[PDB]
Amino acid sequence: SMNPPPPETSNPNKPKRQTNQLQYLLRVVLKTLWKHQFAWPFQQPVDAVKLNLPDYYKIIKTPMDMGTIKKRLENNYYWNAQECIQDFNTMFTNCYIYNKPGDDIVLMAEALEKLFLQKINELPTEE
Ligand SMILES: Cc1nnc2c(NC(C)C)nc(-c3nc4cnc(N5CCOC[C@@H]5C)cc4n3[C@@H](C)c3ccccc3)cn12
């Protein structure tokens, strides 16, 4: 079974805006998470074909990854900080849905989510 197209990362029809919260999500949240030792399985869309997971896109209907989130922030795709936070939440929930609790990949996602929530707790007020 083939891979689906990756999630949309740029749309010229969508309105664009610069806010302190979106800047914090790219410069602090995405940067700190990308550098983490457990980031590598979440840095790109799941390649179900290469990893031989034919049931991945049969179970996960709303895929998300940090590579997509990074591209979305770089292309001013998000209007609200909540849209970006929702994508990170979707990425973590997808990992917990597809894999069994206690599996190494789940433990990896749990450590990244713990760091993510701490950085979202330090999110600055809207300017
Ligand atoms: C996101 C996300 N949510 N669930 C998964 C998931 N589930 C499997 C562990 C069943 N795997 C990956 C996932 N993303 C990957 C990215 N690259 C590879 N590589 C294998 C080929 O050589 C080079 C390259 C580095 C393997 C990957 N895997 C699995 C195979 C894996 C294996 C060991 C440790 C952690 C993950 C993401 N996932």
Residue numbers in the entry: 42 to 168
Give the original sentences from the paper that presented this experimental model:
The binding domain 1 of the bromodomain‐containing protein 4 (Brd4‐BD1) that recognizes acetylated lysine residues, was chosen as model system, due to the availability of a large set of in‐house protein–ligand co‐crystal structures. Brd4‐BD1 contains three tryptophans, yielding a total of nine signals. In order to provide a comprehensive assessment, we selected a set of 13 ligands for which both crystal structures and affinity data were available.
Ligand 3 is representative of ligands with optimal stacking geometries that lead to substantial upfield shifts of the involved tryptophan CH protons upon ligand binding. Although other contributions, for example, differential solvent effects, might play a role, our measurements highlight that the robust improvement in overall binding affinity for ligand 3 can be readily observed and (at least in part) attributed to improved CH–π interactions.
